[PDB]
DNA sequence: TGTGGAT
DNA sequence: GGTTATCCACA
DNA sequence: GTAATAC
DNA sequence: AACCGTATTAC
């Protein structure tokens, strides 16, 4: 039992019986509770189903998921498939109406297309369509509720019953009671299915192969040609009852949805702040709840739950793991999260679960969020429109290069290594002064990656290649040294190992060399590392060739590796392969937007204030007259009107005056107000200049970047060699 | 298979090596990272370890946990045990410094006492002792590393720089980095151990048996005699270095701590609101965050995380399960939580995890929390003194009987069944009017339990026994009926089953009767239930004695069971076996406290306001003088002083006047103020009367209880017979 | 054997 | 997301 | 055969 | 709390 368990129908009836294939055991539960057991069976699917186009045939029939699905249908597969031996008249695929749901449908259809074709062409495979929306009228036991799949139906409901009704946007099947699920999706009389058909065998074949086959480039090409990254889509105005659709159209619509989503909004970083959406949300949410470096740590489970509740509609598993990674300093050059407890190690042993650990933002993460409160960055509504979230962070340092990013999307992947903050900033500052700067010059400031794990990087020519094209291959090699021993014996001591390499497996792989005697002369392998340093010790036998051994180990173990740059990121909504120049130029452009926006915000504040202060200065000279005036008025409105009519204060000033507390009349110091007036006028001038002159703005940009480097700069860790 | 895995020391050295036995794999991780691997081994323990006194040797060595612990020490067990074959000189037990930690230590010591005695008396078992406190990582720029085990040591640390920098209270090992853990508790040079010794074999034997043996009554007696339920404790001035302690004293100190905690603060309900701490926290936290019945549902994971982060220092597993239970209407007579999604069923299939579901408080749960904002109920500080939490809820209905409670503590257990709200309130109302009311009379209003699952309760005489003494045994029997069929055949149709019985297992157990043919004449068993009703059908064969079958099924399946009342609850911090009379009288006494407290609160508001209004009325008559006065003052303080000195306003009035907005000086309408003054005086009179006359107060109490009954009353579900 | 808050 | 253990009391 | 967000 | 599967890309 690696596969979900079948809950059968009460009877045997191939004419009528239906097999529901449900996304996840939990919804499988609800389905089992909500069904009509006389003729409806339930088989839950455990997450993502094997790609039957990519994988072998051997392996496909080692997949318990598949075998229990074959068995259950009771008609074998492929070669011998007999439709008259089927146990159900209908196979209904029921997933969340979200992207990952779309992906599962895709994966299943390419199973049935490739191994149970007669079933598909006989019109016996369907997609169940859960509702997207629920409208609720009153409260308590006077609730009242209806459902809607399109935006047009939803608009029709706003009349039907409105005048204070509210709306739930379903994010999955997991938010539905079994009776809700029956009424909308499982009841023959009221459900809405789509019947999958094959209109053209040729077009369907080609369509399945391009989207699901092991060849990446056709699929990428397809994505570039079909998905509009820049735009929105509009949902299929579903027809109540059955609706036919071609396998071709389904596969295209579904895979398109999924591709786009996991490109834009999962696996690939934004070119400006170098964050994936999950990471952005972790930081924003934590920041918003004041979980910052200067304040107490806060239980990880709390942070995670708020992230999941307010921003990120996905498993806690994913969120926590991401948050953990941001805290591991052997993975990030500048950690964005501090976390008390067991957050793993280089040995790759599992971190404590969120119930154990506690966490806060690091100091430098502060700087990613700097000036977010000042309308510096575009915000969007979250999934249930309760709350706005940033689409990108201000990013007062260029985090994409500094911490890098690895990911795997559809049609694209990324591997950007980390860099030294100070070097990166030196580069950015040069580029601010020299927009057309080329790679050779930039590489005087930014010579290459700087891994948190240190070690030796070799391959100047390929570093340059990578910085030009986004791709290159470099060599990363462990830092070693020899120690003499009693007996006329040596030992090799490793003190730094290559990025992304699991220490405990490295040590094991090395000891396999000894055990199998692949190279002569290894006495014993011992991991001697501790909380104060990395130290692997390879004790050699008496007079064995130290250099023969060390060379063998570099060659045939991960004591030395190749790192491959594949620098891909999201620029204007679309994925893009990019070198240093696009990266740095995008960052600069972004900081420009931030600073301008910041300065417009701060200037409006100072303006509004100065206008008040100008009025208060006047008031003082006529204080008694103003009191008499207010006293002689009828009410708040009347008083303001008289202040305007009689002394030409503005509405804004009049409001300020009239809302002053009585005790203010004691303090009547004009010069302190005049000093404030002065400093405001100065402040507005500085800010106006920035808005009004690109050079002034860019000089500020550079000033701030240097302040950051000054504060956070650290020595390089990885040494660079040329060959 | 099932037990934690040993991470060994680099070398073999029985003279020096140490085996750390660690509470949980996660802390096992930290320990493994923090240790000095040359001589320190690590074996994690997975939660609670088998009680080697209660369970009998055989099952004890089918316990993988124990076998891998025997194996690891390498000296066999029992009478074989050879100390010179041990692999370590020291066996160090390292748990959280919390109650469940204490419990683990207990369980382990009774293993080593009973099966490895020479090891204990050779002074080779130890307890690890992690710190309770830390003087802030958020204390400027850190450089603080300051830890403390007692309150006295903590007071000594308060004389460190930053004159008011902060304190972390460690709740477990999970909040410590591996280097923190080394420095405080694993490093020979700086750790503080307790060395376990046997000072008196006889006293130790007796002490272990009473606390750990299968006999409950000696243990209860021990608890009654030793645990001070109404007191605080005080820790040992621990000695830097080793400190010796007798097995006897350790077992007593540790088990005492655990017993007390799981009696008062885990498994047993409070007699007034009928809640366990976890349940109270769920409701308080959810209410505080406005997650109420009239507002939209909110992701379960979010709720849980906030509960865990602010109030309840225990696993999410426990919290969520408790929250789920509060939503299942076949477990609670009046559900306190509404939950969208798969929250289980009577078939006992597993609920969806908190990442799937969403939830809010039910309408009636509102009434448990009613007037919490009004200082009606004692609050305590939470574990990290950031926030106060209620020790009991106001409880505007008598939830203990209405929903009941089942639990298992140490020395005590509880089983209180649910009751019909209307009946319960009728009883309470009678008792308000008739304090000395006896059971016979009360049972005219409250005749017995009312299970949410319905069915038939038999045994009036035992119900009465239970209502007098707190114990009784009743019979709960499924609701059945016969249906005639075609071939001169009958079938038994069950429509309601007994409380706490899993339907799907019942159906299975019944079908096993058929399959094994234990009794003749069963044709087929069919669960025909659906989301609209429960319906099991037992089709009988032609001429089989349907009464012989039905009787066999009542006897030998859970189609009929015995329910045992064991009504135990917490009254003045101590556990107490109680009938209806203590229960109802405690509730009434509680509502009295609430209403008095409520009325004192509301009256203080009205008082403070009336005093303000009296002052404002005066001001108007002397408005010009008051302005001149303020104008002639120096500052806010000075103005108030002059208002007091010159016009005998109070501080409270003076503050109000001086903080008025200028536009208030328009108004000279005394009438509207006078009407408010009038209403306030009236309101205070009503409230004063309640505080000042028991009768008035109790009539209110009764009024409110009737309002509640009127609103929430539901027909009885369980029918009552006498057997 | 199995209830429900705990590890 | 299911599977697998223990504690505790009481029939 | 492995990285990291997802189911 | 560990153990167990999958998708997606590029060496
Ligand atoms: N039943 C279902 N489980 C999963 N699922 C979720 C995991 C997670 O949230 O981190 C996970 O780590 C995980 C590991 C597994 F090994 C795994 N396996 C299927 C078993 O046969 C092995 C599955 Cl399935 C896993 C799912 F995403 C959806 C499910 F319905
Ligand atoms: N490794 C550890 N696990 C647990 N633990 C925790 C559970 C929970 O928080 O809900 C749980 O449901 C659970 C079930 C188990 F079956 C179980 N088993 C021990 C295995 O051999 C089977 C264990 Cl251990 C369990 C622990 F509380 C502490 C741990 F270190
Ligand atoms: Cl087609
Ligand atoms: Cl002793
Ligand atoms: K068949
Ligand atoms: K850590
Ligand atoms: K190599
Ligand atoms: K003011
Ligand atoms: K539900
Ligand atoms: K029975
Ligand atoms: K005012
Ligand atoms: K007026
Ligand atoms: Mg989903
Ligand atoms: Mg996982
Ligand atoms: Mg603990
Ligand atoms: Mg569990």
Numbering used by the authors:
A (entry chain B), B (entry chain A): 411 to 648, 1001 to 1485
What does the published report state?
Type II topoisomerases (top2) regulate DNA topology which requires divalent metal ions (usually Mg2+) for their enzymatic activity. Metal ions are also known to be essential for fluoroquinolone action in bacterial top2, including gyrase and topoisomerase (topo) IV, which are heterodimers in their active form.
S. pneumoniae topo IV ParE30-ParC55 was cocrystalized with an 18 bp dsDNA, stabilized by a fluoroquinolone delafloxacin. Using this instrument, we are able to pinpoint the location of Mg2+ ions in the fluoroquinolone (delafloxacin)-stabilized Streptococcus pneumoniae topo IV cleavage complex with high confidence. Although the full octahedral coordination was not observed in this relatively low-resolution structure, this Mg2+ pair is believed to coordinate the fluoroquinolone molecule through water–ion bridges with a serine (S79) and a downstream acidic residue (D83) that are conserved across bacterial species. The second pair of Mg2+ ions is found at each catalytic pocket of the ParE TOPRIM domain coordinated by the aspartate residues D506 and D508, which correspond to the proposed B-site. This is consistent with the observation of a single catalytic metal at B-site in many other drug-stabilized topo complex structures, which is likely representative of the involvement of Mg2+ in stabilizing the DNA-cleaved conformation. The K+ site is remarkably conserved especially in topo IV of Gram positives suggesting a subunit-bridging role in these enzymes, though divergence of M101 (to G) and N105 (to W/F) in other bacterial top2 might affect K+ binding and enzyme function. A second pair of K+ ions is located in the ParC tower domain coordinating between F316 and N324 (FKYTDLQ), specifically F316, K317, T319, and Q322 and further coordinated through water networks to D320 and N324. Although Cl− are not typically associated with topos, we identified a pair of Cl− ions coordinating between ParE C-terminal residues E609-D610 and ParC N-terminal residues L9-E10, potentially supporting additional structural integrity.
